Design a protein around this ligand. Structure first.
Ligand SMILES: *[C@@H]1O[C@H](CO)[C@@H](O)[C@H](O)[C@H]1NC(C)=O
Lengths: 456, 456
């Protein structure tokens, strides 16, 4: 009885997008998810629909084979993503006596693991756009998993190389608790122990922990000075902020210099106010420019034209805070009544990772093209060898795929299913105006550390 | 589409039994299974129905909580067992908005792995009765898996202890190639290197290898005499037999003293004709007395009073090679009509592991009782804490369970989910008629070797 986004075709690409936030702590059992999401949700849904459209128009790629998809809501939770993934498979097992060819998603690593653990049973390839856990690289455990996104070892790598470039010997190690935290640090600690660096103080904390928890963290960090000067935070955007708040109450400022992972990146949202305590820090952003195209598509979207996305109505009302002349999903919660002509441009922000989400889809497309070229030579449409499509076949076939990234970037996969790492080094500093801004100071292109030393 | 055995209750225990043989080599894709099975199938089906009945009758075990089950056909194949297992979960996810509480089965280890890999993703405990492979003990990989029978490893300890009891210094090491062979031997070879024993000659061979392969094995074994006097075979049934055939052509006779694993056990099948080449060997059987009760129940089964087993009709006709006039399940292959009241005794042989299959069920029962005693205090029936039942909770619960085996035997589980050792020491010798009979000469109850020395 949960909603599903469908668009028909010859080969159906199935995706898992966090359309709604995850179910509240106590409702997980009955699997009723929370409020709707635009960035990690409605956009990506529309992104897939859109992308898939551009492709059915490209006369070069997948000529007379239409790509269709079935998009399900992951609610950013294993509990549900699995609930849905089952259905991918249930349905598939049936149209064998339309089936899924592969799956784009899910967004979280800790979840993509669950999806992969289930999806791999049934020879369904899985391409991910933001799952950076480094456990996924173990192809003995996650054989049918790949990503259009780099692995996090590559990030502990770039962070270490940053620590290397500046002749540093002792660095504190703080990271967010969980998978994102452990994975990366586990790779830094080790990648570090090799290159020589001696890890000074080492701690771990939950992003949603009390001020008490952080204060205890800040103390410990300070006590290990002056060696524990450089703190390396493989931390979630808020683990950092939390650490800054601990610096506010303790009134210390300028004691620590930081190096943070894409959890922090160049988000204003993290150093809000705390511009000072969190100044001069260096962070890793993810290399990915906003898609020219998508913006033009996701904005001229109307409440009465969009026929394929059953969530729009819900979304739309939540996005403008208003309720309709009755409907089926009339969201009562509101006092105002939608005109239906509101503009999606007020406070519009394209999904950050939005670039990746598309690459992923393409890989799934390209993968199919190649499978076709080899298994149906000369043939224009789909031949008996791809009716139905073979899992393990499409898999190694996706692995051996290369295409022009959504932004003139090159895209391919190594033997483990990972992607090449292109990072951006960010530094927080005082410019000319009254602004504390994130200044781009360097790049990391697979092993190549480029820092404009004079810009820091 | 595929039939399912269903008995309603308050907590539904799900089971996977090989009702049919596995689908022929080339039909696996469409998943159509072969001929019906009585021992590994109809009996166990009936065994579960039966057992569950005695438990709904026991005044003490689950007083006002009826145990029900849903029994599905595994066809002794991953392809299908998974197909069905999905349904356990499909259904289960649904009643959350009747669900499975746990699963008895499957039969094979290589399969139980697939079932466990899927069943674990949804917090469904899994109790197995004949899956003995060692890998399942890794709880980091098969967290929700346990059994009421020991691992293969245990065996080694008992085989070695047998070697220890007789003051032997040099033994030959032969075993089957594959999962079984390597596992056990790997544990012997090591358990042996500790206790002191010096491994003389050491070899490994495939059960389905040519007479050439074995002859080469036999030679090598002999050459290492008189030290390589005691050969320790951690071998499948036929690996042994094959070795006997090698002794026939080379015309040699009992130069060796064999010690074989449950692959050989007390199977007449293995020493067919070669009663002489192999007479005297010592083997390890798995203690499993026949169930008094079951026999009485399975035999008085009428084709018209037994409605809960949908397979009976099919089975019945295949068991007596006759058809049933105008039936919804009338078989055409046969020539003469079924009297309907043929006797199920002609050549009746109770399932060998039939004892285990029941223990398993009980554990699932007992497990539930305890979760009830702990979580529904004051309530006689099921309380909101068990509506629905919690996976991870029932599981570690099951673990901490202990009950009187179906045959006085004690039953519990260690922290990995494995069961206690209960090997029976069989020796082949000449008794009273022209029968070479396996004679029971000793037991191994977790570390305790007991051999009636005078009986050998
Ligand atoms: C529970 O079952 C027993 C007999 O099996 C009966 O005496 C008792 O009344 C039952 N309890 C309830 C609440 O019905």
């Amino acid at each position: 009885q949960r909603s599903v986004a469908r668009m028909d075709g010859d080969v159906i690409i199935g995706a898992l997008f966090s359309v709604h936030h995850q179910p509240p702590a106590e409702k997980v059992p009955e699997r009723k998810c929370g409020e709707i999401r635009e960035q990690y949700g409605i956009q990506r849904v529309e992104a897939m629909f859109h992308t898939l459209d551009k492709i059915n128009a490209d006369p070069v790629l997948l000529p007379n084979i239409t790509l269709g998809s079935e998009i399900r809501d992951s609610c950013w939770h294993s509990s549900v993503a699995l609930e849905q993934s089952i259905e991918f498979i249930r349905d598939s097992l049936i149209s064998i006596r339309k089936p899924i060819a592969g799956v784009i998603g899910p967004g979280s690593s800790s979840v993509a693991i669950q999806v992969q653990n289930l999806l791999q049973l049934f020879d369904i390839p899985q391409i991910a756009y933001s799952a950076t856990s480094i456990d996924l690289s173990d192809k003995t455990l996650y054989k049918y998993f790949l990503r259009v996104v780099p692995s996090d070892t590559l990030q502990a790598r770039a962070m270490l190389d940053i620590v290397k470039r500046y002749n540093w010997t002792y660095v504190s190690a703080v990271h967010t608790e969980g998978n994102y935290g452990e994975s990366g640090m586990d790779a830094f600690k080790e990648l570090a122990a090799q290159e020589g660096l001696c890890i000074a103080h080492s701690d771990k904390i939950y992003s949603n922990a009390g001020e008490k928890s952080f204060d205890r963290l800040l103390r410990k960090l300070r006590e290990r000075l002056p060696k524990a000067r450089v703190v390396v935070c493989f931390c979630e955007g808020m683990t950092v902020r939390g650490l800054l708040s601990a610096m506010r109450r303790l009134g210390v400022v300028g004691e620590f210099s930081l190096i943070g992972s894409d959890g922090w990146a160049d988000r204003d949202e993290v150093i809000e106010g705390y511009e000072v305590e969190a100044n001069g820090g260096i962070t890793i952003k993810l290399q990915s420019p906003e898609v020219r195209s998508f913006d033009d598509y996701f904005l001229k979207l109307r409440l009465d034209t969009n026929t394929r996305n059953p969530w729009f109505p819900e979304f739309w009302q939540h996005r403008f805070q208003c309720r309709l002349p009755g409907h089926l999903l009339e969201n009562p919660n509101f006092k105002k009544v939608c005109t239906g002509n509101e503009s999606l441009e007020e406070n519009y922000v394209q999904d950050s990772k939005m670039g990746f989400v598309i690459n992923a889809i393409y890989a799934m497309a390209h993968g199919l093209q190649n499978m076709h070229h080899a298994l149906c030579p000369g043939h224009v449409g789909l031949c008996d060898a791809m009716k139905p499509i073979d899992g393990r076949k499409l898999l190694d076939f996706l692995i051996k795929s290369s295409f022009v990234g959504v932004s003139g970037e090159e895209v391919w996969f190594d033997e483990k299913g990972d992607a090449p790492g292109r990072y951006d080094i960010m530094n927080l500093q005082y410019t000319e105006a009254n602004r504390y801004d994130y200044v781009h100071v360097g790049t990391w292109h697979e092993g190549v550390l480029n820092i404009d030393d004079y810009k820091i």
